[PDB]
Write a protein that binds this ligand. Sequence first.
Ligand SMILES: CCC(=O)N1CCC[C@@H](Oc2nc(-c3cnn(C)c3)cn3nccc23)CC1
Length: 256
Amino acid sequence: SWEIDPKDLTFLKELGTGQFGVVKYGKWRGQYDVAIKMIKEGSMSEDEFIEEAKVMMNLSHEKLVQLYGVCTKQRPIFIITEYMANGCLLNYLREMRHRFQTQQLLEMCKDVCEAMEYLESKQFLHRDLAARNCLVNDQGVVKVSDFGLSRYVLKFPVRWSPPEVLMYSKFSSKSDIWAFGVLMWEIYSLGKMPYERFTNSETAEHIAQGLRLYRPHLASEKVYTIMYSCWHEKADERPTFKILLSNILDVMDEES
Ligand SMILES: CCC(=O)N1CCC[C@@H](Oc2nc(-c3cnn(C)c3)cn3nccc23)CC1
């Protein structure tokens, strides 16, 4: 049920190369748009991924990039997903032509928060949430991509990691919460690199001294309060995604 026949795939355009390999646009059975992730040989714990792919295919949410299936009876193996016409969110934010209103930026945050609240309810961690791992469809909807995929990569996201990850490798729902706050910052900074004047090593040292990302000028005071709550020193004092969604909806109503 998780296996797609590669003979049903028509490769049409190269979209670019990502963290796991080249990505191409194509058609399934000459009809349906798909993205084809070609996993470069030797780069992935493939046996482990196949078994988790069966779990990932039961995760269905409108704001999760849908896994259609995999091709593993050959090499290199393929991951077949929903095609997102406007590409990755990081590049989308950096296209200044869009001249985003802040209501649009907030809607991007809400889209991701809904997907993350869904994964939280399923006790599934993303483990590498960032704007590079979010995608935008033709209607401008943002969806979360490649959730959990870093577990099978055989360059660590320091700038999206809370102190207990940098210090102790302590992963939890709350390290996803922290990363979400950084993602809100990426969105409202129109895709700047977090801690844009620091190296990873300096970021870690400054994070330990209590430094935090400044308020992007496009975020209102209430929006900065939301992203800032994701960065509490003590992980247990960080909200859940259900709480963040209620907070995002509250601000959306106030700034409508
Ligand atoms: C931020 C990361 C990044 O830039 N890349 C390189 C490119 C491939 C990208 O993946 C997809 N890219 C597009 C796309 C790219 N350009 N246009 C017009 C659409 C669509 N879909 N639909 C499912 C997946 C992808 C991820 C990695």
